[PDB]
Design an enzyme around this catalytic site. Structure first.
Site, PDB file in Angstrom:
ATOM      1  N   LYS A 163       0.978  -1.554  -0.250  1.00 40.36           N
ATOM      2  CA  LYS A 163       0.428   0.242   0.323  1.00 40.36           C
ATOM      3  C   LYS A 163       1.013   1.466  -0.420  1.00 40.36           C
ATOM      4  O   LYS A 163       0.341   2.441  -0.562  1.00 40.36           O
ATOM      5  CB  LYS A 163      -1.135   0.182   1.056  1.00 40.36           C
ATOM      6  CG  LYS A 163      -2.005  -0.919   1.225  1.00 40.36           C
ATOM      7  CD  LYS A 163      -2.993  -0.506   2.103  1.00 40.36           C
ATOM      8  CE  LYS A 163      -2.707  -0.754   3.774  1.00 40.36           C
ATOM      9  NZ  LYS A 163      -1.614  -2.348   3.991  1.00 40.36           N
ATOM     10  N   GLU A 183       0.161   6.071  11.423  1.00 40.56           N
ATOM     11  CA  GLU A 183       1.020   5.357  10.533  1.00 40.56           C
ATOM     12  C   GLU A 183       2.200   5.675  10.854  1.00 40.56           C
ATOM     13  O   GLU A 183       2.334   5.848  11.777  1.00 40.56           O
ATOM     14  CB  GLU A 183       1.014   5.986   8.716  1.00 40.56           C
ATOM     15  CG  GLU A 183       1.525   7.001   8.290  1.00 40.56           C
ATOM     16  CD  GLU A 183       2.265   7.401   6.706  1.00 40.56           C
ATOM     17  OE1 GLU A 183       2.541   8.535   6.451  1.00 40.56           O
ATOM     18  OE2 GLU A 183       1.869   6.149   6.228  1.00 40.56           O
ATOM     19  N   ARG A 184       2.848   4.333  10.498  1.00 41.25           N
ATOM     20  CA  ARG A 184       5.325   4.682  11.218  1.00 41.25           C
ATOM     21  C   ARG A 184       4.838   5.955  11.033  1.00 41.25           C
ATOM     22  O   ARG A 184       5.079   6.900  10.454  1.00 41.25           O
ATOM     23  CB  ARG A 184       5.310   4.399  10.397  1.00 41.25           C
ATOM     24  CG  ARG A 184       5.195   2.112   9.847  1.00 41.25           C
ATOM     25  CD  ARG A 184       6.663   2.245   9.510  1.00 41.25           C
ATOM     26  NE  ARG A 184       6.201   0.766   9.098  1.00 41.25           N
ATOM     27  CZ  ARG A 184       5.079   0.049   8.437  1.00 41.25           C
ATOM     28  NH1 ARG A 184       4.152   0.215   7.666  1.00 41.25           N
ATOM     29  NH2 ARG A 184       4.812  -1.639   8.760  1.00 41.25           N
TER      30      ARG A 184
END
Ligand SMILES: Nc1ncnc2c1ncn2[C@@H]1O[C@H](COP(=O)(O)OP(=O)(O)OP(=O)(O)O)[C@@H](O)[C@H]1O
Ligand SMILES: Nc1ncnc2c1ncn2[C@@H]1O[C@H](COP(=O)(O)OP(=O)(O)O)[C@@H](O)[C@H]1O
Ligand SMILES: Nc1ncnc2c1ncn2[C@@H]1O[C@H](COP(=O)(O)OP(=O)(O)O)[C@@H](O)[C@H]1O
Ligand SMILES: [Mg+2]
Ligand SMILES: [Mg+2]
Lengths: 188, 127, 477, 467, 467
Positions: E154, E180-181
């Protein structure tokens, strides 16, 4: 079961059930006024900081609480109805919501003697003559023997006019709602 | 929180000192009835799984003994039981007849003959 | 009784006491019960306080006195912990004396933002040929180790820890790595044996061990990772390098699920609450790599997950795969067959550490990776060559246990393998060659390996001398 | 302290203590009971009320009965006088041989040995059985899972382990039967009496049985494993020896825990198990360790629901096992005994660093040759015996000899085999299999290895049957 | 106004105002914190209490603490001065570069465009990716969605799309990284600084970044998508421009809700999800439309829990998208990359009246052959590829060639694999698939197509393979 006599205004919840029990008990034998006075008395008696601090601690055993409340009731000469009600609230541990009961019964007693709480809201205060004609017309709204309980708050959020509540009946002659209505009429 | 015996009828009874003329040790008054479960007020001296007997001739087994009430399961249709009924202890856990007098007899769960061949002999009972 | 700084346990049971009082207790604050336990005040409710007990609820009773400590849940951190075992609250359990630490860090402190961090530029050496050449791990990375029951994951962690000694015995303060091993829901026998193994390898003088074994209440297993991560964040923020190994992060998930269900929270998928992803990301977002304006320290993380029957698309494995910077898929089929470490190089990747790998290892491992990749796709002439070379490499990457290798020896061995010197050696004898070959270079030719290590690359002269060494040795084997 | 029963919902009893509350896990005795009823506290609901799980039938209890607070958890009689005596979870004897007379009592809710009371070095428990000691050695103070459990020799193997451990190392043993069929419980009692591990006369027994019956409420079947652990912990600590603890069955332990958790009113977790499954198992399995005084080696019989190895119950128990034994119906057919599956059996300590390089190499060679024979059997079934090479017929012969030698005669089965039981030490086993693998005995007949002790017995059998 | 905290459960705080109550969505400031803690109101509980969701850590909140009403929802800075900056949920810069100086603030809780504002135009957006361009052609101004489990591609795909589309884009762009990270956000920031898309020392920045990464509580992840939406809406409505709005990962917006829903005392629905999943998703996703005042071409990465497309979250998102792109782990395990599943991926503009007749015919031929291969796969897996007619073997060979050919080497993966990034104009894609379909390349080996740009590169690869 014993066909309890229902109160006029139905209060609901734990306080509602206790207050309806008290009202049914008092209505038979007829002691509503005296029991209401005693309820107002216990409203302050328990409110004492020492008593309140000693009754909101759940680590004093229910036995000690019931004994202290029996001593207080005897020291104040109450009707057996109010003494038994306090004992019952103490046994069930429902002391933390005792005032909600006294409040409920008040709401339940005011309607018994015929009262319809009312509210009037205006941008600014009123001259006593106009308040007098308001009293007259609102008493016209009510029925026979139904005393009125007027409250005249002042809301500047509305831009004028008047807003009147009689029980659940509501009439809104405030400039704000007319402005809203006309504006929405424009946009359509 | 809330209890099922805090209904305004019980509190009304207890406020005006009417809870002393009722024997809340061997008798009880049905608080609720529905879907074959009755919730009874009283029966303070009732044992778990003891059989109580309702006023309308029905029987029931008292399974749930809670602080407020007793949960009785009715042995039949709860059509005949109404809130406020009177429930009396039987005193004994449920037991059934036993012996060679049952051989060749169709009986129901409680040892009552249902084949219409006459009463059931029954010399001995057993829990 | 002071009903502001003190309360009384209304109701114990489930490991979630309800207290009445503590009117001035902060959320997530640590309170102390009369008996001796400690708790954390989760639910500040209008009429009570829900305190999760960090211990056994047997010791708590309704009526006991809870006294607020006045500080948020924090643990003692510092150099004083190295070489010590400690429970989840920082209290020593190895009986070597009081921990004696000066600084206390919050376990719930937030991870560094987007500006402090910087790309991963330094290599974290694990002394495992398969890991070091094919899935390198940088410093500041988060490299999940995911496997099954008994497939050799704790072995990877302990080999890493034992390998760090080459650097922690030297003088360069920029290469020393301080290890931390968090053991969660794990047999205490295993933890004791592991600590003895570390002490025998002189690997405790720079290792902290946080224990939350299977006999420890659920809150302690839920809180051990955060205690360990704070103990590591100390080094990260003080300009030093740390390496924390949570083992496993699935036992922590089970403990948190127990905690949530006992609190009557809405179970989700596999009865896990909705916070499990947050539970693990909150924790693994702290393994950062600060930039030189913040110290330049780093905190690597090696979470361990135990799949169930090899299911990698489960719920918790997928969460932690969405949190971490890579994988090291240990395959049970390979492990049972005979390949050990059973790393499934096909499915194991390291997104970040590829650029931190050492040049000397970089050049050799590049061709190793290409050769293994080609072999993976064919399992006549070129086909036979690929099969032979791939089998040579696969038998080359087998390794012993508790015997980590320096990067230079790995370079020498992989170089011998990939340049086709073993293409004639029978596939079974490769290990016998390997363990022998190293000794040779580990004895006579230390100058070559030292030069490779210092220069950080296989220079052309180093290449030529290594060629000579390997060919001459293979001549007499 | 005295309280009153306020509520009785099924097997859950809510009691009220006007004076002082008992801590969680205590035991309370209901006064006014024809047979001792014990209630274990589990919650503090507030308002001085506690909620207790009953250890016996609660029928016939009345809201108001007096309940006496013992002051300590369930305390059972532990000592050397429990050996050969059956007793239920609360320690009352149920074999009708009189009271269990002892000068010691132990509470069943104890804690795992601290981190410093832990042996740091692995060990090996020599049971005197070839297959167990070679292909799956039993770690000292480590859990062993035992599979099969149906007419394959589980009881005879259990009795043989008891006898060997009480004869070699001299330690005693406990048999905690969790959720135990009363029929099979009586059968086991009598099998032990016959084989001799229990002696009703001279008081030289070697087993203490603790039966948590299958018709006891869920709150009793959940604690009998703890009663067995207490009886074994006495021997570990106080007597300072190595004990065996047979838990049959462990799935029933988890299942009873699940039922108790549901009854108390807790949300189930994964597959409808208790939310506390991992900790409920760990608190018990962490008391079966090797302290610095003695050790407890446990042997859990294990049942895998739906044959699913990933079900939370075995998925959680397998995390604790330190070995595995797999009795197979397919090997009792061949007349091999004990019918332990040599290849499916597993051990964690089968590691050259623990069991030694020679033991490890012998075990690996035996496993490899057995796998080779298994593979060759397909070829024999299809292409026929002729198709083999000469370096494969030899392996077939060697593997058949090894299979025969792995069988052994038990001392507790002399009425089933007509032979005399052998307790083969370890060195004898390793040497025998080393010699067979080397090929030193390729000239003997296969049947010369069937049901013999050490290798020298195989030599003697060959001489006796050939001459 | 001024209220006082009364309850503080998780990230949900109850505040009691004796005077005027604040409306819903209205923001509150907890007075007495080191940093700014904003509580977004969510419910009125009666008795003059409001439940609120905290946009930051709630540790340290004391019952009775003071909360000050702010009078308006979370208002963030919007304008051309939010380009090249990094913001958080409440609009505070987190790039350590000074306050975002704008003269116009926007409340993040605006309403969706009415119906008389929608635009019906449907163009095609060329991304240079073979699988995306041929079978699921992205449209300009439409909503796009990349579905895929963990670690399927993704973020790599969305970074490739950033690179391509937003390098050839003259308009603005907005990246909202929700859940997200954090190191991924740092890498994005530095890639843009290097690539010139951000000027730290000028006013030619064309990307506004918003970030509520995974380390932040559930109250910040829920309401950061709205911040990105507001920053994009300004550039659409006011500036009247064409915007690119990349989101990654939008699942974390619904997930976060289910974390607070539990604490808001709401009955969970399907799988523990909040009862209001679809309504919240709709109110978020109908503000990302392209109206008549401008255009937003939003690409959203959507995470599929446990690879389950039957999950309520992705299943609900499917109805809010023009083009999908179901990334698949099965395909990614074959080495194909991007792992787009050609049969799950769809698009609204795959219409012969928009893409053409050669494009449409080629796409449908590819899909038909892939579906035939999927039908055969079950038999091929057991009976083997020998029990197939010749037409079926031809179908299998063509389908495998097509499967490999759909794989492409991205530039953002130059670091992963060392290959060279490739863009494949639409005409080249259509021509190559026409040729493969007609059978022009049946003499090549299927591994000659694995990871190549246009087909002539496949032919060159095959020639090199011949050597
Ligand atoms: N490199 C290796 N070479 C040989 N044997 C190994 C190797 N690594 C591990 N083993 C063997 O595997 C066994 C289990 O190893 P390890 O404890 O690392 O796996 P684990 O996943 O940690 O186990 P668990 O899941 O039970 O904690 C050890 O007993 C060891 O003998
Ligand atoms: N060593 C042995 N020698 C002879 N027979 C054995 C041996 N071990 C097991 N058996 C046989 O296995 C059968 C089952 O025994 P047992 O395990 O006691 O019952 P269960 O398997 O039901 O527990 C017995 O009939 C016995 O003959
Ligand atoms: N185009 C590609 N080429 C090669 N590898 C890829 C490609 N796309 C994804 N990958 C693999 O997937 C990993 C990245 O997964 P990613 O998409 O970032 O995870 P998520 O799906 O959680 O965003 C990389 O490690 C890489 O090995
Ligand atoms: Mg391990
Ligand atoms: Mg991603």
């Amino acid at each position: 079961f014993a066909k309890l006599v229902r109160p006029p205004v139905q209060i609901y919840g734990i306080e509602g059930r206790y207050a309806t029990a008290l009202y049914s008990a008092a209505s038979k034998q007829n002691k509503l006024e005296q029991v209401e006075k005693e309820l107002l008395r216990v409203g302050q008696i328990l409110k004492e900081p020492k008593m309140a601090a000693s009754l909101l601690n759940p680590y004093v055993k229910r036995s000690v609480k019931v004994k202290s409340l029996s001593d207080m009731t005897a020291k104040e000469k109450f009707s057996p109805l109010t003494s038994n009600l306090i004992n019952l609230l103490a046994e069930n541990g429902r002391l933390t919501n005792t005032p909600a009961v006294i409040s409920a019964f008040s709401t339940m007693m005011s309607v018994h003697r015929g009262e319809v709480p009312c509210t009037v809201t205006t941008a600014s205060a009123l001259d006593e003559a106009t308040l007098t004609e308001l009293k007259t017309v609102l008493k016209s709204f009510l029925s026979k023997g139904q005393v009125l309980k007027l409250e005249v708050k002042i809301d500047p959020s509305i831009m004028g006019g008047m807003i009147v509540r009689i029980g659940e009946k509501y009439v809104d002659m405030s400039a704000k709602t007319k402005i809203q209505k006309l504006s929405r009429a424009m946009r359509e | 929180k809330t209890g099922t015996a805090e209904v305004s009828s019980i509190l009304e009874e207890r406020i005006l000192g009417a809870d002393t003329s009722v024997d809340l040790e061997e008798t009880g008054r049905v608080l609720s009835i529905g879907d074959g479960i009755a919730r009874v007020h009283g029966l303070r001296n009732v044992q778990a799984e003891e059989m109580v007997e309702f006023s309308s001739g029905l029987k029931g087994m008292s399974l749930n003994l809670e602080p407020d009430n007793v949960g009785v399961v009715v042995f039949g249709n709860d059509k005949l039981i109404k809130e406020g009924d009177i429930v009396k202890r039987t005193g004994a856990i449920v037991d059934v007849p036993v012996g060679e007098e049952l051989l060749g007899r169709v009986v129901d769960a409680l040892g009552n003959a249902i084949d219409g061949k006459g009463p059931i002999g029954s010399k001995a009972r057993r829990r | 009784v002071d009903l502001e700084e003190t309360g009384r346990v209304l109701s114990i049971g489930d490991g979630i006491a309800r207290v009445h009082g503590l009117r001035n207790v902060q959320a997530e604050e640590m309170v102390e019960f009369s008996s001796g336990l400690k708790g954390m005040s989760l639910n500040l409710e209008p009429d009570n306080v829900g305190v999760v007990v960090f211990g056994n609820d047997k010791l708590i009773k309704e009526g006991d006195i809870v006294k607020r400590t006045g500080a948020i849940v924090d643990v003692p951190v510092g150099e004083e912990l190295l070489g010590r075992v400690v429970d989840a609250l920082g209290n020593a359990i190895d009986g070597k004396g009081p921990i004696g630490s000066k600084a206390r860090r919050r376990v719930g402190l937030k991870a560094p933002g987007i500006i402090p961090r910087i790309s991963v530029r330094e290599p974290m050496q694990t002394g495992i040929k398969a890991v070091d050449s094919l899935v390198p791990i940088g410093r500041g990375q988060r490299e999940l180790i995911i496997g099954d029951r008994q497939t050799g994951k704790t072995s990877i962690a302990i080999d890493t820890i034992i390998n760090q000694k080459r650097f922690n015995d030297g003088t360069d303060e920029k290469k020393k790595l301080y290890c931390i091993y968090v053991a969660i829901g794990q047999k205490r026998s295993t933890v004791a044996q592991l600590v003895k193994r570390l002490t025998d390898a002189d690997a405790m003088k720079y290792t902290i061990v946080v224990s939350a074994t299977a006999s420890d209440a659920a809150p302690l297993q839920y809180l051990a990772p955060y205690s360990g991560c704070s103990m590591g964040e100390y080094f990260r923020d003080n300009g030093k390098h740390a390496l924390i190994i949570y083992d496993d992060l699935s036992k922590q998930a089970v403990a948190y699920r127990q905690m949530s269900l006992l609190l009557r929270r809405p179970p989700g998928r596999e009865a896990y609450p909705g916070d499990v992803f947050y539970l693990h990301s909150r924790l693994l977002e702290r393994a950062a790599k600060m930039n030189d304006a913040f110290g330049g320290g780093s905190l690597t993380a090696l979470p361990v997950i135990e799949t169930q029957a090899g299911d990698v698309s489960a719920y918790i494995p997928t969460n932690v795969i969405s949190i971490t910077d890579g994988q090291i898929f240990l395959e049970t089929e390979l492990f049972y067959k005979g390949i050990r470490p059973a790393i499934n190089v096909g499915l194991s990747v390291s997104r970040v550490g590829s650029a931190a790998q050492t040049r000397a290892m970089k050049q050799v491992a590049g061709t190793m990776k290409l050769e293994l990749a080609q072999y993976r796709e064919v399992a006549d002439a070129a086909t036979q060559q690929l099969l032979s070379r791939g089998v040579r490499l696969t038998e080359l990457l087998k390794q012993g246990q508790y015997s980590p290798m320096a990067i230079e020896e790995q370079v020498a061995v992989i170089y011998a393998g990939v340049r086709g010197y073993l293409d004639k050696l029978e596939p079974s004898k490769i290990t016998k060659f390997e363990n022998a070959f190293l000794s040779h270079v580990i004895s006579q030719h230390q100058a070559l390996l030292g030069k490779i290590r210092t220069d950080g690359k296989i220079s052309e002269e180093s290449d030529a001398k290594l060629k000579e060494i390997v060919t001459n040795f293979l001549a007499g084997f | 302290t005295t309280g009153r029963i306020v509520a009785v919902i099924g097997a859950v009893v809510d009691v009220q203590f006007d004076e002082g509350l008992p801590p969680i896990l205590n035991a309370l005795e209901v006064q006014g009971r024809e047979t001792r009823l014990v209630l274990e506290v589990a919650q503090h609901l507030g308002e001085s009320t506690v909620r207790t799980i009953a250890m016996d039938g609660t029928e016939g209890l009345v809201r108001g009965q007096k309940v006496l607070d013992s002051g300590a958890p369930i305390r059972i009689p532990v000592g050397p006088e429990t050996l050969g005596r059956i007793m239920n979870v609360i320690g009352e004897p149920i074999d009708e041989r009189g009271p269990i007379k002892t000068k010691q009592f132990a509470a069943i809710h104890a804690e795992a040995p601290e981190f410093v009371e832990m042996s740091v070095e692995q060990e090996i428990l020599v049971t005197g059985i070839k297959v167990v000691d070679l292909l799956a050695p039993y770690a000292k103070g480590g859990k062993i899972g035992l599979f099969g459990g149906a007419g394959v020799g589980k009881t005879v193997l259990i009795m043989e382990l008891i006898n060997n451990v009480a004869k070699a190392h001299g330690g005693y043993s406990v048999f905690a039967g969790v959720g135990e069929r009363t029929r099979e419980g009586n059968d086991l009692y009598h099998e032990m009496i016959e084989s001799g591990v229990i002696n009703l006369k001279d008081a030289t027994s070697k087993v203490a049985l603790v039966y948590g019956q299958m018709n006891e409420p869920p709150g009793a079947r959940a604690r009998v494993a703890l009663t067995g652990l207490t009886v074994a912990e006495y021997f570990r600590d106080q007597e300072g020896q190595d004990v065996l603890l047979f838990i049959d069955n462990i799935f029933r332990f988890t299942q009873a825990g699940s039922e108790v958790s549901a009854l108390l009113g807790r949300i189930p977790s994964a597959v409808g198990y208790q939310p506390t499954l991992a900790t409920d198992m760990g608190t018990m399995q962490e008391r079966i360790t090797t302290t610095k005084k003695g050790s407890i080696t446990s042997v859990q019989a294990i049942y895998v629901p739906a044959d699913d190895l990933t079900d939370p119950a075995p998925a959680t128990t397998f995390a604790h096992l330190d070995a595995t034994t797999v009795l197979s119906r397919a090997i009792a057919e061949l007349g091999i005994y004990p019918a332990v599956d040599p290849l499916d059996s597993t051990s964690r300590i089968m590691d050259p660093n623990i069991v030694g390089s020679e033991h490890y190499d012998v075990a690996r060679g035996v496993q490899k040759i057995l796998q080779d024979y298994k593979s060759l059997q397909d070829i024999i079934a299809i292409l026929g015996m002729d198709e083999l090479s000469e370096e494969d017929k030899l392996t077939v012969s060697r593997a058949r000899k090894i299979q025969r030698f792995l069988s052994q005669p038990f001392q507790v089965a002399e009425v089933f085999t007509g032979h005399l039981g052998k307790l083969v030490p370890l060195k004898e086993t390793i040497k025998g299999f080393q010699q067979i693998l080397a090929g030193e005995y390729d000239h003997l007949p296969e049947q010369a290895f069937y049901m013999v002790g050490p290798i020298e017995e195989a030599v003697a059998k060959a001489d006796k049957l050939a001459e």
